């Protein structure tokens, strides 16, 4: 009969977020990165509101809720950006925000052209794999539950159950033919491979933003409060190996 989980994910999916970028100023490293940082700060508000509205999320210990959001935001935001880029510009450009679309020139000026190329490839995967909106939403929800401390969470048992349930929801919505069991298996394989592929991209961006925050005063790049806190307190836990992604495949 009529489900519920998908209804919820569709209902809570964040709307359009603008970066507040002044497209009159030249495309300088300082201007572009300061705008991406502000976009991050703005999107973080929406990620928190989204996560708190997810089925079961409030069952986690409050400190664990904070922790998973602070570790997973980069992956979540990149994955969502890849989808926007796919749907809006067929992955030709990176659609960070309606007022902050990166073309080749901006990719170069941002000094993260290589990372942008990887993000474009991620975006293109949505087309190559013909990912459905429902597959996208379930995959994105699972990204929230895909990075934790090596030492575990305060209530790891509840987390493990929640993650299991999100994996089950993804399995249920995969676009495949049940009459051909091999198709469903191949599809699930492809999707878990796609999910895993987000992590190395997020890692490169974690390294970049950390290095940027350290030199931010020297290169005139502004970091808002929440971003500067998370990049200085949580991101280094990832970079130092205290916090690691949960991969499907070895």
């Amino acid at each position: 009969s009529q489900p519920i989980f998908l209804n919820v994910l569709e209902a809570i999916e964040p709307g359009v977020v603008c970066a507040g970028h002044d497209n009159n100023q030249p495309d300088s490293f300082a201007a572009l990165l300061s705008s991406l940082n502000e976009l991050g700060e703005r999107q973080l508000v929406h990620v928190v509101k989204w996560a708190k509205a997810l089925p079961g999320f409030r069952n986690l210990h409050v400190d664990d809720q904070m922790a998973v959001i602070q570790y997973s935001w980069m992956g979540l935001m990149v994955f969502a950006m890849g989808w926007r880029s796919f749907t809006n510009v067929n992955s030709r450009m990176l659609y960070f925000a309606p007022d902050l679309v990166f073309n080749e020139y901006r990719m170069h000026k941002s000094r993260m052209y290589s990372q942008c190329v990887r993000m474009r490839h991620l975006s293109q995967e949505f087309g190559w794999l013909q990912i459905t909106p429902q597959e996208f939403l379930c995959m994105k929800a699972l990204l929230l539950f895909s990075i934790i401390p090596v030492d575990g969470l305060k209530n790891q048992k509840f987390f493990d159950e929640l993650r299991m349930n999100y994996i089950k929801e993804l399995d249920r919505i995969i676009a495949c033919k049940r009459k051909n069991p091999t198709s469903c298996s191949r599809r699930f394989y492809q999707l878990t491979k796609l999910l895993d592929s987000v992590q190395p991209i997020a890692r490169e961006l974690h390294q970049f933003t950390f290095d940027l925050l350290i030199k931010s005063h020297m290169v005139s790049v502004d970091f808002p409060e929440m971003m500067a806190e998370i990049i200085s307190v949580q991101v280094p836990k990832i970079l130092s190996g205290k916090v690691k992604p949960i991969y499907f495949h070895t």
């Binding site: 973080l44 509101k49 904070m66 959001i69 409060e225 806190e229």
Partner: peptide, 12 residues
Amino acid sequence: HKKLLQLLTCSS
């Protein structure tokens, strides 16, 4: 940490 946790405390 203030603004971030504030987004969780508000209407918990």
